[PDB]
Structure 1
Amino acid sequence: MGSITENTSWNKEFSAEAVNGVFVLCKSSSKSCATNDLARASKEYLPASTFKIPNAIIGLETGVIKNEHQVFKWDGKPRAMKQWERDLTLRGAIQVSATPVFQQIAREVGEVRMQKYLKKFSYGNQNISGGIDKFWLEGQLRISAVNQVEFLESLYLNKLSASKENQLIVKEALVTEAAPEYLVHSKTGFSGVGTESNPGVAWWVGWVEKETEVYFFAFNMDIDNESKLPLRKSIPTKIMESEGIIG
């Protein structure tokens, strides 16, 4: 958007849970954003599963994902999560966050084309070192909350450097709540619990369409205890509720 202002009153929801994190919320019509922590809003972290958004688009663009209705066949091998042990649509693989499906997509896209698309998308530090199938999971790729909102705004407007149809296909795959005058697109992320001095990161990013308004959001937090994960949704929902958006 245009402006960003720091709203320190938004710390109340973080301090109540002893969480270190940031929430960025932008209202389209007023071209204005608010955040609890300006400094952290610009700090870059591992995207983890939020990378499914650009990866899905790049997969379609390059033709690795053949079309909108491609089925990703479970081959029979045990997977890290139980919910991934089945055939999945593109929307399904995004929604249940089936990481191995996307690791294979990334391998097929390749280094040259992945690099070019992350440049076109202005996606974070654009550092894809750490292996083609994990740079966004444990490698060197980093993105800020502000950069996520910018990327999501471009996607909403079909202004990414990709076909309008591929942007649309990925947008329907991101729908997480549908009501007559309320629509939510969103995606979670979780890198793990980390180590001594290096906590992991949790994400919730997306946008809310309410009546004729649109609000873009990005949340992240430091995490070293997996039982704290639901906070990645509860904190932003509480803040958006207080704003009259209602999460």
Structure 2
Amino acid sequence: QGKEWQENKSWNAHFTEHKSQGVVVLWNENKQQGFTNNLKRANQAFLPASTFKIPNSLIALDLGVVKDEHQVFKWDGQTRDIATWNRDHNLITAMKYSVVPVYQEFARQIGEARMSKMLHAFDYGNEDISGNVDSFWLDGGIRISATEQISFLRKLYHNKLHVSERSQRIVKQAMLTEANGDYIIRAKTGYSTRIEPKIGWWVGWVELDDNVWFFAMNMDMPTSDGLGLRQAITKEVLKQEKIIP
């Protein structure tokens, strides 16, 4: 009651079960109240990695670098380690498969000056694009906490970012991850591997009939083996909190 952030260390049981470490942050939009298993880690800023595809998508769409969610981004012919990257993509499949090369091309066309202005307008993380214009979210200066992800996501949900309503609608479509008669999840995965420590991200929100629960989680990810725990652990927390059955 009235508390801004409440710590619930019982969620650590979900991390410990999988011999892992991290944070889940929830925000109840109706009550304007946050919950986390770790207040400190909740506010620790990391590389966004592929969670950066949300603001990158928005900026690309607003500037006309991406025409719409149907525009085809031709594979450059370089065979990369992730099979799904080695084919043509539109914004939907690029987001779904986390296709870095497509987004690196977006970033180059956006350019450092306009990328910087946009991240300042978005109040995104530390607003620092230092490093390579086409890799800064992977190994440059930009850093964002789970609680800063939620602030940015809430603005996207309410179409309050200083880009077009259309841009915001298309990205929220592109974020669609799961839906049934109980809930809808719009979300984006990330895996930061270029700079220690290696972490997994899942950020987004749960739409219910009468409420929205924003979430941002990150966890230590020494190998790709555990990538599935990003979603599995978040769902164990959403279930415990009765947000999803």
Q: Give your verdict on TM over 0.5.
A: yes
Distance 1:68 1:2, change over 3 A: farther
Q: In structure 1, what is the Cα distance between the partners aligned to 2:74 and 2:26?
A: 37
- Aligned counterparts of 1:55 and 1:10: Cα–Cα separation in 2: 32
Q: CA deviation at 1:2?
A: 7.8
Q: What is the aligned residue count? A: 244
Q: Superposition pairs for residues 164-179 of structure 1, below 5 Å? A: 164-179=165-180
How far apart in 1 are the matches of 2:98 and 2:32? 32
Counterpart position of 1:204: 202
SS in structure 2 of the partner of residue 187 of structure 1: strand
**Pairwise mapping of residues 92-171 of structure 1 onto structure 2 (< 5 A)?**
92-171=93-172
Aligned to 1:26, the other structure's residue is in SS state strand
The partner residue of 1:240 within 219, 235, 238 is 238
- Counterpart CA distance in 2 for 1:78 and 1:223 is 25
Give % identity.
Answer: 48
Query: Which contiguous aligned blocks of 4+ residues in structure 1 show a shift greater than 3 angstroms?
Result: none
Could you tell me which runs of 5 or more consecutive residues in structure 1 were left unpaired when the two chains were aligned: none
Q: Tell me by how many angstroms 1:193 deviates.
A: 7.6
| 1:211 Cα deviation from its structure 2 partner | 1.7
Q: Which residue of 1 aligns with 2:40?
A: 39
| 8 Å CA contact retained: 1:205, 1:217 | yes
Q: Distance in 2 between matches of 1:163 and 1:132?
A: 23
* Residue of structure 2 in register with 1:230 after alignment: 228
For normalisation by structure 2, the TM-score amounts to: 0.94
- Which letter maps to 2:138? L
For 1:211, give the aligned amino acid.
Answer: D
Unaligned segments of structure 2, at least 5 residues:
none
Q: Is the 8 A contact 2:139 2:194 kept in 1?
A: no
TM-score by length of 1: 0.94
User: Within 2, Cα distance between the matches of 1:189 and 1:29?
Assistant: 27
User: Which amino acid counterpart does residue 214 of structure 1 have in structure 2?
Assistant: V
SS of the aligned residue for 2:136 comes to: coil
**Distance in 2, Cα, partners of 1:87 & 1:131:** 24
CA distance in 1, matches of 2:43, 2:50: 19
> Cα RMSD between the aligned structures?
1.7
**Alpha-carbon offset, residue 201 of structure 1:** 1.1
User: 1:112 aligns to what SS in structure 2?
Assistant: helix
CA deviation after TM superposition for structure 1 residue 79, in Å: 2.7
Letter in 2 for 1:158: N
1:23 paired residue number: 24
2-side partners of 1:239 and 1:72: how far apart? 37
Aligned residue identity for 2:179: A
How far 1:48 sits from its partner (Å)? 0.4
Decide whether the 8 Å contact of 2:51 with 2:203 is kept in 1: yes
The residue type equivalent to 1:209 in the other structure is E
CA distance in 1, matches of 2:17, 2:38: 16
- 1:225 aligned partner, one-letter code: T
